[PDB]
Design an enzyme around this catalytic site. Structure first.
Site, PDB file in Angstrom:
ATOM      1  N   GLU A 172     -17.184 145.312  63.468  1.00 10.79           N
ATOM      2  CA  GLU A 172     -18.292 145.713  64.339  1.00 10.79           C
ATOM      3  C   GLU A 172     -18.707 144.647  65.334  1.00 10.79           C
ATOM      4  OE1 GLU A 172     -19.347 148.662  64.531  1.00 10.79           O
ATOM      5  OE2 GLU A 172     -18.906 149.630  62.615  1.00 10.79           O
ATOM      6  N   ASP A 199     -21.731 151.397  72.083  1.00 13.63           N
ATOM      7  CA  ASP A 199     -20.601 151.349  71.165  1.00 13.63           C
ATOM      8  C   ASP A 199     -19.384 152.051  71.755  1.00 13.63           C
ATOM      9  OD1 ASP A 199     -20.922 154.116  70.769  1.00 13.63           O
ATOM     10  OD2 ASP A 199     -21.585 153.963  68.703  1.00 13.63           O
TER      11      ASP A 199
END
Ligand code: 3GZ
Length: 164
Positions: A11, A20
Protein backbone atom coordinates in the site's frame (compact mmCIF):
# COMPACT_ATOMS: atom_id res chain seq x y z
CA UNK A 1 7.65 -10.68 7.48
CA UNK A 2 4.22 -10.17 9.03
CA UNK A 3 0.90 -8.77 7.83
CA UNK A 4 1.87 -5.18 8.69
CA UNK A 5 5.13 -5.33 6.74
CA UNK A 6 3.37 -7.05 3.84
CA UNK A 7 0.58 -4.48 3.55
CA UNK A 8 3.03 -1.61 4.09
CA UNK A 9 4.90 -2.84 1.02
CA UNK A 10 1.72 -3.25 -1.02
CA UNK A 11 0.00 0.00 0.00
CA UNK A 12 2.90 2.39 0.57
CA UNK A 13 2.75 5.36 2.96
CA UNK A 14 1.54 8.82 1.97
CA UNK A 15 0.69 11.52 4.50
CA UNK A 16 -1.49 13.66 2.24
CA UNK A 17 -4.78 12.69 0.59
CA UNK A 18 -4.08 10.84 -2.67
CA UNK A 19 -6.08 8.84 -5.20
CA UNK A 20 -5.68 5.07 -5.08
CA UNK A 21 -5.39 2.75 -8.08
CA UNK A 22 -9.17 3.03 -8.62
CA UNK A 23 -9.22 6.84 -8.43
CA UNK A 24 -10.61 6.97 -4.86
CA UNK A 25 -9.44 9.39 -2.16
CA UNK A 26 -7.16 7.59 0.27
CA UNK A 27 -4.52 8.46 2.86
CA UNK A 28 -1.81 6.83 4.96
CA UNK A 29 -1.22 3.12 4.33
CA UNK A 30 -4.10 2.48 1.97
CA UNK A 31 -6.81 3.93 4.18
CA UNK A 32 -9.81 4.50 1.88
CA UNK A 33 -11.60 7.73 2.78
CA UNK A 34 -14.53 7.69 0.36
CA UNK A 35 -15.59 6.63 -3.10
CA UNK A 36 -17.20 10.05 -3.62
CA UNK A 37 -15.63 12.29 -6.30
CA UNK A 38 -15.74 15.15 -3.79
CA UNK A 39 -12.42 16.09 -2.17
CA UNK A 40 -14.43 17.96 0.46
CA UNK A 41 -16.27 14.73 1.31
CA UNK A 42 -12.91 12.98 1.65
CA UNK A 43 -11.59 15.75 3.92
CA UNK A 44 -14.68 15.40 6.14
CA UNK A 45 -14.11 11.65 6.41
CA UNK A 46 -10.46 12.23 7.27
CA UNK A 47 -11.27 14.70 10.03
CA UNK A 48 -13.84 12.27 11.47
CA UNK A 49 -11.34 9.38 11.32
CA UNK A 50 -8.54 11.26 13.04
CA UNK A 51 -10.66 13.40 15.38
CA UNK A 52 -9.18 16.79 14.48
CA UNK A 53 -9.18 19.25 11.58
CA UNK A 54 -6.45 17.81 9.33
CA UNK A 55 -6.97 19.78 6.13
CA UNK A 56 -5.95 16.70 4.16
CA UNK A 57 -2.66 15.92 5.92
CA UNK A 58 -1.78 13.52 8.76
CA UNK A 59 1.29 12.44 10.72
CA UNK A 60 3.06 9.09 10.38
CA UNK A 61 1.76 8.12 13.84
CA UNK A 62 -1.79 8.87 12.71
CA UNK A 63 -1.30 6.84 9.53
CA UNK A 64 -0.03 3.89 11.57
CA UNK A 65 -3.01 4.14 13.93
CA UNK A 66 -5.48 3.99 11.03
CA UNK A 67 -3.47 1.05 9.65
CA UNK A 68 -3.73 -0.85 12.94
CA UNK A 69 -7.49 -0.26 12.97
CA UNK A 70 -7.81 -1.29 9.33
CA UNK A 71 -5.89 -4.55 9.73
CA UNK A 72 -7.94 -5.38 12.83
CA UNK A 73 -11.11 -4.68 10.94
CA UNK A 74 -10.04 -6.89 8.04
CA UNK A 75 -9.36 -9.76 10.45
CA UNK A 76 -12.64 -9.29 12.29
CA UNK A 77 -14.47 -9.19 8.99
CA UNK A 78 -13.00 -12.56 8.06
CA UNK A 79 -13.95 -14.05 11.42
CA UNK A 80 -17.54 -12.78 11.06
CA UNK A 81 -17.98 -14.07 7.52
CA UNK A 82 -19.41 -17.57 7.25
CA UNK A 83 -17.71 -18.18 3.90
CA UNK A 84 -14.30 -16.80 4.85
CA UNK A 85 -13.80 -18.02 8.40
CA UNK A 86 -13.56 -21.77 7.68
CA UNK A 87 -11.06 -21.18 4.88
CA UNK A 88 -9.01 -18.77 6.99
CA UNK A 89 -8.98 -21.18 9.95
CA UNK A 90 -7.69 -23.93 7.65
CA UNK A 91 -4.68 -21.88 6.50
CA UNK A 92 -1.19 -21.68 7.97
CA UNK A 93 0.12 -18.36 9.29
CA UNK A 94 1.74 -17.16 6.06
CA UNK A 95 -1.28 -17.91 3.91
CA UNK A 96 -3.50 -16.22 6.51
CA UNK A 97 -1.59 -13.03 5.71
CA UNK A 98 -2.39 -13.40 2.02
CA UNK A 99 -6.07 -13.74 2.94
CA UNK A 100 -6.01 -10.63 5.13
CA UNK A 101 -4.22 -8.75 2.34
CA UNK A 102 -7.02 -9.49 -0.15
CA UNK A 103 -9.77 -8.50 2.32
CA UNK A 104 -7.88 -5.30 3.15
CA UNK A 105 -7.68 -4.40 -0.54
CA UNK A 106 -11.16 -5.43 -1.72
CA UNK A 107 -13.40 -5.79 1.30
CA UNK A 108 -16.06 -8.49 1.29
CA UNK A 109 -18.70 -7.49 -1.27
CA UNK A 110 -17.07 -9.70 -3.91
CA UNK A 111 -16.61 -12.82 -1.79
CA UNK A 112 -19.12 -14.89 -3.79
CA UNK A 113 -17.05 -14.37 -6.94
CA UNK A 114 -14.17 -16.12 -5.16
CA UNK A 115 -16.23 -19.20 -4.24
CA UNK A 116 -14.15 -21.53 -6.39
CA UNK A 117 -10.83 -20.07 -5.20
CA UNK A 118 -11.96 -20.46 -1.59
CA UNK A 119 -12.81 -24.12 -2.13
CA UNK A 120 -9.43 -24.79 -3.72
CA UNK A 121 -7.65 -23.04 -0.85
CA UNK A 122 -9.62 -25.09 1.70
CA UNK A 123 -8.65 -28.22 -0.20
CA UNK A 124 -4.99 -27.12 -0.15
CA UNK A 125 -4.82 -27.36 -3.94
CA UNK A 126 -2.35 -24.49 -4.05
CA UNK A 127 -1.38 -24.45 -7.72
CA UNK A 128 -5.02 -24.75 -8.81
CA UNK A 129 -6.04 -21.99 -6.42
CA UNK A 130 -3.28 -19.76 -7.80
CA UNK A 131 -4.50 -20.30 -11.36
CA UNK A 132 -8.10 -19.57 -10.37
CA UNK A 133 -7.22 -16.42 -8.39
CA UNK A 134 -5.55 -14.89 -11.45
CA UNK A 135 -8.77 -15.17 -13.47
CA UNK A 136 -10.06 -11.95 -11.94
CA UNK A 137 -10.50 -8.24 -12.39
CA UNK A 138 -8.28 -8.01 -9.29
CA UNK A 139 -5.35 -9.65 -11.03
CA UNK A 140 -5.79 -7.67 -14.26
CA UNK A 141 -6.05 -4.27 -12.56
CA UNK A 142 -3.25 -4.74 -9.98
CA UNK A 143 -1.15 -7.57 -11.45
CA UNK A 144 2.08 -7.03 -9.56
CA UNK A 145 0.36 -6.98 -6.17
CA UNK A 146 -1.92 -9.86 -7.14
CA UNK A 147 1.11 -11.88 -8.27
CA UNK A 148 2.78 -11.36 -4.87
CA UNK A 149 -0.35 -12.33 -2.97
CA UNK A 150 -0.93 -15.36 -5.23
CA UNK A 151 2.68 -16.52 -4.85
CA UNK A 152 2.17 -16.32 -1.09
CA UNK A 153 -0.91 -18.57 -1.38
CA UNK A 154 0.87 -20.91 -3.80
CA UNK A 155 4.01 -21.42 -1.70
CA UNK A 156 3.18 -20.53 1.90
CA UNK A 157 6.44 -18.55 1.94
CA UNK A 158 7.39 -14.89 1.87
CA UNK A 159 9.44 -15.29 -1.31
CA UNK A 160 7.51 -12.63 -3.24
CA UNK A 161 8.12 -10.03 -0.53
CA UNK A 162 11.63 -10.82 0.74
CA UNK A 163 13.43 -8.75 -1.89
CA UNK A 164 10.99 -5.93 -1.18
C1 3GZ B 1 -11.70 -10.86 -1.39
C2 3GZ B 1 -12.07 -12.32 -1.07
C3 3GZ B 1 -10.86 -13.24 -1.25
C4 3GZ B 1 -11.21 -14.71 -0.94
C5 3GZ B 1 -10.00 -15.66 -1.08
C6 3GZ B 1 -8.86 -15.33 -0.11
C7 3GZ B 1 -9.33 -15.43 1.35
C8 3GZ B 1 -9.67 -14.28 2.03
C9 3GZ B 1 -10.11 -14.35 3.35
C10 3GZ B 1 -10.20 -15.58 3.98
C11 3GZ B 1 -9.86 -16.74 3.30
C12 3GZ B 1 -9.42 -16.67 1.98
Amino acid sequence: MNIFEMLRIDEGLRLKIYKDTEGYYTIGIGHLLTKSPSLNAAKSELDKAIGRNCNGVITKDEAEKLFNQDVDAAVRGILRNAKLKPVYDSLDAVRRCAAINMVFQMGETGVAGFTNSLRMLQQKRWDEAAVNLAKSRWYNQTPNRAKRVITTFRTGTWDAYKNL
